[PDB]
Coordinates of C-alpha atoms and ligand atoms in Angstrom, one line a residue:
X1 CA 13.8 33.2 15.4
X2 CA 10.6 34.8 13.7
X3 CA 10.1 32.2 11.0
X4 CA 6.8 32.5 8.3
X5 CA 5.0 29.3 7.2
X6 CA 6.3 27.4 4.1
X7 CA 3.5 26.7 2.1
X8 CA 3.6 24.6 -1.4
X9 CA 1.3 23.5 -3.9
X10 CA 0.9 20.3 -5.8
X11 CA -1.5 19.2 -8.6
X12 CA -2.3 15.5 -9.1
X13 CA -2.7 14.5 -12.4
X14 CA -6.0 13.8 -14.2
X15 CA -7.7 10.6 -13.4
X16 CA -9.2 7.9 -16.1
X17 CA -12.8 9.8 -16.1
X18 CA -11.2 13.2 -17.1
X19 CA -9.3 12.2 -19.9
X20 CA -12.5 10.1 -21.3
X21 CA -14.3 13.2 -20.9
X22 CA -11.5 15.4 -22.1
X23 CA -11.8 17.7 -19.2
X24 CA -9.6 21.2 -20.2
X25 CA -6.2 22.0 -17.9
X26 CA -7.2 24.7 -16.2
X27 CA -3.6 24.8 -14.1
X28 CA 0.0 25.7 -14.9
X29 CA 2.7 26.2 -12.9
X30 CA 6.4 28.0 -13.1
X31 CA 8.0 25.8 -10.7
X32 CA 11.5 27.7 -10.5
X33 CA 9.7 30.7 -9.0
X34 CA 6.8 29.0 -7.2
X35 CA 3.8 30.2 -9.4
X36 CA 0.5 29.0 -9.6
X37 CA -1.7 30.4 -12.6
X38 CA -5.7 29.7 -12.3
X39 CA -7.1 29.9 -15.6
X40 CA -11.2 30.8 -15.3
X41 CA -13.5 30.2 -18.7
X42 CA -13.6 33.3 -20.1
X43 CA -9.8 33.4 -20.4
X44 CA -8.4 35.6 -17.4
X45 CA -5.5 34.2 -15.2
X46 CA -5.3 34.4 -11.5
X47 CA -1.6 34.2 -10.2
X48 CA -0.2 33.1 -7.4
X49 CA 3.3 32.5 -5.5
X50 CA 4.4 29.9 -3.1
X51 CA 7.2 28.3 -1.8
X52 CA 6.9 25.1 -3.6
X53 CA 5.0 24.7 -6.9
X54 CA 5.0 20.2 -7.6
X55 CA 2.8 20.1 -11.0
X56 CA 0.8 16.9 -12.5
X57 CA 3.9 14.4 -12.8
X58 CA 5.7 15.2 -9.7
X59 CA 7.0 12.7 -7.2
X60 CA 6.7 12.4 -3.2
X61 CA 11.2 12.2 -3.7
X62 CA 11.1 15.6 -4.9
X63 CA 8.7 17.2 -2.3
X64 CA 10.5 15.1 0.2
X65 CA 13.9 16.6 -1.1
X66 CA 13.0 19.8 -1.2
X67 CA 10.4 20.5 1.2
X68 CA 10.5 17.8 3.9
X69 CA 13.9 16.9 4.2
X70 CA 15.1 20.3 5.7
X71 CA 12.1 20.6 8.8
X72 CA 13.0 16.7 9.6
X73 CA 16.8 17.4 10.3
X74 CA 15.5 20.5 12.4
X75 CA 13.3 17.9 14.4
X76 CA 17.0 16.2 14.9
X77 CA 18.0 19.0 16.3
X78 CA 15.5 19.1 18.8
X79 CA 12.8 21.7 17.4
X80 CA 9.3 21.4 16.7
X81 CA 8.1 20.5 12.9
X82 CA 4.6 20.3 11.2
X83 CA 3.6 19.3 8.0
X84 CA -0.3 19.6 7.5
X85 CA -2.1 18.5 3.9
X86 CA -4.8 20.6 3.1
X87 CA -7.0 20.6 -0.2
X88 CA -10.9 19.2 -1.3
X89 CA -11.4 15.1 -1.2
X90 CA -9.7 13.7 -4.4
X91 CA -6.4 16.0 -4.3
X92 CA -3.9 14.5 -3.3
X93 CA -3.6 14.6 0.8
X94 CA -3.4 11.7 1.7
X95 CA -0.8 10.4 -1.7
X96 CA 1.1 13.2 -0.4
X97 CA 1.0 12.3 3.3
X98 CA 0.7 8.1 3.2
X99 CA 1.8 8.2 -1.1
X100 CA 2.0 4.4 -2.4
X101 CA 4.7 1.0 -2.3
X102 CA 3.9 0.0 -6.0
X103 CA 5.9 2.8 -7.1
X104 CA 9.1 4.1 -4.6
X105 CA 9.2 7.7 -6.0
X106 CA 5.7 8.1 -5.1
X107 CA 5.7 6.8 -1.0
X108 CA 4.6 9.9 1.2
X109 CA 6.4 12.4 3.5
X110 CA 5.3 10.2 6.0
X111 CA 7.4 7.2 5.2
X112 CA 10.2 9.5 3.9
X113 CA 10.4 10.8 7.6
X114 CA 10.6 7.4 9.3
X115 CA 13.5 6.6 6.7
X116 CA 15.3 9.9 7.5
X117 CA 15.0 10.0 11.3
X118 CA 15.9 6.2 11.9
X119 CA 19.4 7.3 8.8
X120 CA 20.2 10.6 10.6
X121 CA 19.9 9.4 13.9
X122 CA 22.7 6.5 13.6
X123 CA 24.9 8.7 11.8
X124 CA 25.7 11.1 14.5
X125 CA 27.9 9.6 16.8
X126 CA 27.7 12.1 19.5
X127 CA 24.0 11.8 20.4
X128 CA 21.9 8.7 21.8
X129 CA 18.5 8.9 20.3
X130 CA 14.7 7.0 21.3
X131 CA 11.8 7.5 18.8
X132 CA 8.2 7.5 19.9
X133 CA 5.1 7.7 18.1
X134 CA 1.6 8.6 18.6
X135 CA -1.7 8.5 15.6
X136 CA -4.7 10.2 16.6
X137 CA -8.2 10.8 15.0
X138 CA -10.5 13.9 15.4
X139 CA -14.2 13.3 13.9
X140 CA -17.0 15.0 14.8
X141 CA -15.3 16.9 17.9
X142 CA -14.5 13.3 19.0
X143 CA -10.7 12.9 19.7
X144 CA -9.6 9.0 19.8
X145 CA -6.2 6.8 19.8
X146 CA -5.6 4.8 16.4
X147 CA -2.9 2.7 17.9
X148 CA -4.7 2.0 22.1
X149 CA -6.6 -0.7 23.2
X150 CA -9.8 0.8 23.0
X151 CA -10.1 2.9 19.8
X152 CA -13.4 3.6 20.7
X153 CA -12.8 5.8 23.7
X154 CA -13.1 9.4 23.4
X155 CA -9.9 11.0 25.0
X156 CA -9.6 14.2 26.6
X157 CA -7.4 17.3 25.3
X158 CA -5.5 18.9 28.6
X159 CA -2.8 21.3 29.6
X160 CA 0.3 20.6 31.8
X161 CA 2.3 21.9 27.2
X162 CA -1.3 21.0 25.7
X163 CA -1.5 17.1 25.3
X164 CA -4.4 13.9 24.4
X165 CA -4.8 12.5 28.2
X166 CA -4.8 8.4 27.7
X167 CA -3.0 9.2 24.4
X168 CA -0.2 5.7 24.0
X169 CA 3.0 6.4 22.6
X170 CA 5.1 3.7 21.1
X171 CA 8.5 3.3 20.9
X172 CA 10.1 2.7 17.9
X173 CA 13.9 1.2 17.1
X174 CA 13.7 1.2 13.5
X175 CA 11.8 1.9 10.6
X176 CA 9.8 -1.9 10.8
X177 CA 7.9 -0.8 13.7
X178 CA 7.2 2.9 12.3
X179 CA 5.7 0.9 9.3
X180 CA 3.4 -1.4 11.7
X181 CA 2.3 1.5 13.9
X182 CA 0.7 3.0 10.1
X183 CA -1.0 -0.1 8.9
X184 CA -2.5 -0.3 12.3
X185 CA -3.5 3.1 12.3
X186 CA -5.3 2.4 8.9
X187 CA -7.0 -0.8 10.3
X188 CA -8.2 1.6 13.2
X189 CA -9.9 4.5 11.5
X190 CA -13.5 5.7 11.6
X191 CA -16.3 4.0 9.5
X192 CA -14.8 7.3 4.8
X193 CA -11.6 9.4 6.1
X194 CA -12.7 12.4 4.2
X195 CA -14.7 14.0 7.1
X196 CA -11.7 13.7 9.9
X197 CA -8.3 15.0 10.8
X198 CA -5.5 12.2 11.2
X199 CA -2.4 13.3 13.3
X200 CA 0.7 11.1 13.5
X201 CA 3.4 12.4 15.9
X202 CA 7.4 11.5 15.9
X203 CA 8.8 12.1 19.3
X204 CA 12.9 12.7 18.4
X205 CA 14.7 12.5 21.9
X206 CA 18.3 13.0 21.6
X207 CA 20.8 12.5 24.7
X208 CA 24.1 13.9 24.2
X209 CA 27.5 12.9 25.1
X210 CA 27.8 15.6 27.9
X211 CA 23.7 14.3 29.5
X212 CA 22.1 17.1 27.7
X213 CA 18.5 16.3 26.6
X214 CA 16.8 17.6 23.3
X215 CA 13.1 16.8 22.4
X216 CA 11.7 17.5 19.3
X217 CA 8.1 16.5 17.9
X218 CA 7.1 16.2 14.1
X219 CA 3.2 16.4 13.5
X220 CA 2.4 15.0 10.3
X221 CA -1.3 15.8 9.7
X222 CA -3.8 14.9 7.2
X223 CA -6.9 17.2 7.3
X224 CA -10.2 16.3 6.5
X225 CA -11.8 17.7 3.0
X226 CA -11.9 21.6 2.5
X227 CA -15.0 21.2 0.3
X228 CA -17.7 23.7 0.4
X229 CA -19.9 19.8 15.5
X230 CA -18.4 17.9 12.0
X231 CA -16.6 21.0 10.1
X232 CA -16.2 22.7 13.6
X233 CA -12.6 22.0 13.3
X234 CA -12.0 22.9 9.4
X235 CA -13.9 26.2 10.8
X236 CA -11.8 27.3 13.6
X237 CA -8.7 26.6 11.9
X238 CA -9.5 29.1 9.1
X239 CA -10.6 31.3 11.6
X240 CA -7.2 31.4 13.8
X241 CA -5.3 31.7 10.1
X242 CA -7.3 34.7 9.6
X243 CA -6.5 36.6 13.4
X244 CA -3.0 35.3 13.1
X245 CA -2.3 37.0 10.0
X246 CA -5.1 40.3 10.2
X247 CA -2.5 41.8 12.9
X248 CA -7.3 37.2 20.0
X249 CA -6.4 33.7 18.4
X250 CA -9.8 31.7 18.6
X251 CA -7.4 27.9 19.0
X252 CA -9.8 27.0 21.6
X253 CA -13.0 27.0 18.9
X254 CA -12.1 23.6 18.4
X255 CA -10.1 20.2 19.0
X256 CA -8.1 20.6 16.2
X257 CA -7.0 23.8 16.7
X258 CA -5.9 23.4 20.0
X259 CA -3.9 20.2 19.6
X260 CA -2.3 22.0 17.0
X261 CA -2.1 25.7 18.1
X262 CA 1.7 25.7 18.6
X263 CA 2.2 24.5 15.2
X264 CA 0.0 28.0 14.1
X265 CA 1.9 31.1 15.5
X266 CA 4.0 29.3 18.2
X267 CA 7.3 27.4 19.0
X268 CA 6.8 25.3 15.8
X269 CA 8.8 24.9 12.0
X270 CA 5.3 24.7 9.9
X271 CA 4.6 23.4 6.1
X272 CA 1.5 23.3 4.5
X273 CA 0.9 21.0 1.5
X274 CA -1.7 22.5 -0.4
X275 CA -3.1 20.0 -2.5
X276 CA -5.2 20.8 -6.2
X277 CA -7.1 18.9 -8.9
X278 CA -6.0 20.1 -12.6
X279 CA -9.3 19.8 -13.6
X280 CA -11.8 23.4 -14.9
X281 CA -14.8 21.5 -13.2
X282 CA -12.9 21.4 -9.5
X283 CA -12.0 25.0 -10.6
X284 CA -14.0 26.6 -7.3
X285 CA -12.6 24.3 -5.3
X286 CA -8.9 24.8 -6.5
X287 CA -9.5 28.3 -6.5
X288 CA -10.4 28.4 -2.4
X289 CA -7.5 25.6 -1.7
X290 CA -5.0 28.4 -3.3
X291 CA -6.9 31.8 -1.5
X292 CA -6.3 29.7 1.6
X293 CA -2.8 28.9 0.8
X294 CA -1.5 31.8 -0.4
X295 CA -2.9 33.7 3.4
X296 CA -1.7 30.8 4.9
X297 CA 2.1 32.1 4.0
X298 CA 1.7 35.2 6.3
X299 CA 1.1 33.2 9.6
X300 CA 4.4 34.4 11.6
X301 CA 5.7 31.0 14.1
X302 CA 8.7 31.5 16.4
X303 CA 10.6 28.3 16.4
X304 CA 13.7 27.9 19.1
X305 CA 15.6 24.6 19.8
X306 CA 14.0 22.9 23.1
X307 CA 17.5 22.4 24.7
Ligands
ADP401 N1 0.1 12.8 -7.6 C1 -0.7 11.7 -7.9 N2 -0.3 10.8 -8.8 C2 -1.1 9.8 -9.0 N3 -2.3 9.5 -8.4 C3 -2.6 10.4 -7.5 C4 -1.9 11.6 -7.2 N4 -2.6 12.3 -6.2 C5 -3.6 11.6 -6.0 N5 -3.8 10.5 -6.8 C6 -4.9 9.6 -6.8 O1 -6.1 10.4 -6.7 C7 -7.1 9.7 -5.9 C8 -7.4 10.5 -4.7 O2 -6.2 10.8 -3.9 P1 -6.2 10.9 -2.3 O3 -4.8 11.0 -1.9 O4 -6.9 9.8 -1.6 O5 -6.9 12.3 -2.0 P2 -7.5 13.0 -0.6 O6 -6.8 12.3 0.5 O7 -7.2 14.4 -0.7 O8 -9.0 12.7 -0.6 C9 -6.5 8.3 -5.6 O9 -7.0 7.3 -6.5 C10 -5.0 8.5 -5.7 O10 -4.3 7.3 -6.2
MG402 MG1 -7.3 11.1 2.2

């Protein structure tokens, strides 16, 4: 079915240095219909309208809830999902994405998916199910494994559908070794993650009473910085956004954008977690994050259940 990508906004509150400098609000929100007002200096409001609208006190729970919850229990079903965070360094994409422990309404989408595959998954009787995962890293052009035996190697992207030659997967029973495959992930990383692209992949195979097979794959993926061969793939990816919704699709400008170009215009559920400061000094910044959000909406995927 002809399916538009969900996109939603959150603001993160103000940290210790704005409130000693008593930086001005320069967001609100209406969160029952999804809007977004910019406020610039001189006064004027520029309004907005998304899917999703999560202001200063929200809670991963509630994005979860409402956002999340819904494309995981498609994956179940055997279609494709992918949520991507996108927003300057400081936002909010990776709270949003990895969130913390110290405080359980705040753990990311990505720990909220481990919980709700590994739930869902024993509670329907009529289907076997075997989770794999994958975590990958895309700096500077250079595609590597964050779970292998040599991180350092440089992996290849090929086509059989468009895959990471070399690229492990891991099989996963339960939510412990989800968990472990993270923290490793993290130990793994680039030396500081604000310049690359992290993509962890749940493989959902489910094997049904009858010997049917269904096989769907959730991307979760946390982009590098949209702050105005390193921003090749930031590049490409607004460039594909903008010939997928102006009515050729460049996906092959970069790695990232290749990897990913199902998720953009293909057999794919897509959300887009667009992440904003409060603050009237990140007011440019905030102001592209939502342009880029709001175009982002009009990307048109075709999702079907690979069965
Ligand atoms: N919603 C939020 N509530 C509380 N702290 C937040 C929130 N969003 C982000 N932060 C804090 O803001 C800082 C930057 O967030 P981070 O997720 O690392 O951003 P990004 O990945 O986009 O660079 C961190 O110190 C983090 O704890
Ligand atoms: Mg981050």
């Amino acid at each position: 079915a002809a399916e538009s990508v969900r996109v939603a906004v959150r603001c993160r509150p103000f940290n210790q240095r704005e409130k000693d400098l008593n930086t001005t609000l320069c967001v609100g929100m209406t969160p029952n219909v999804g809007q977004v007002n910019l406020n610039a200096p001189d006064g004027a409001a520029k309004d907005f309208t998304f899917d999703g609208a999560y202001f200063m006190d929200s809670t991963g729970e509630q994005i979860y809830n409402d956002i999340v919850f819904p494309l995981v229990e498609n994956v179940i079903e055997g279609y494709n999902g992918t949520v991507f965070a996108y927003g300057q360094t400081g936002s909010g994409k990776t709270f949003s994405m990895q969130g913390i422990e110290t405080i359980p309404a705040q753990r990311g989408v990505i720990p909220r998916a481990f919980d709700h595959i590994f739930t869902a998954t024993a509670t329907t009787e009529n289907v076997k199910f075997l989770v794999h995962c994958s975590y990958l890293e895309i700096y500077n052009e250079e595609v590597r494994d964050l779970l292998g035996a040599d991180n350092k190697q440089k992996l290849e992207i090929k086509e059989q559908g468009v895959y990471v030659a070399g690229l492990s997967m891991h099989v996963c029973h339960d939510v412990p070794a989800c968990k472990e495959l993270m923290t490793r992930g993290f130990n793994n990383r680039h030396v500081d993650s604000s310049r690359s692209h992290s993509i962890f992949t749940v493989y959902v195979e489910g094997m049904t009473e009858t010997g049917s097979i269904r096989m769907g794959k959730l991307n979760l993926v946390d982009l590098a910085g949209s702050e105005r061969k390193i921003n090749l793939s930031l590049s490409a990816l607004g460039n594909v956004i903008s010939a997928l919704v102006d009515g050729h699709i460049p996906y092959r400008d970069s790695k990232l954008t290749r990897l990913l170009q199902d998720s953009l215009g293909g057999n794919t559920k897509t959300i887009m977690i667009a992440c904003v400061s409060p603050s009237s000094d990140n007011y440019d910044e905030t102001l592209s994050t939502l342009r880029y959000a709001n175009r982002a909406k009009n990307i048109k995927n075709k999702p079907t259940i690979n069965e």
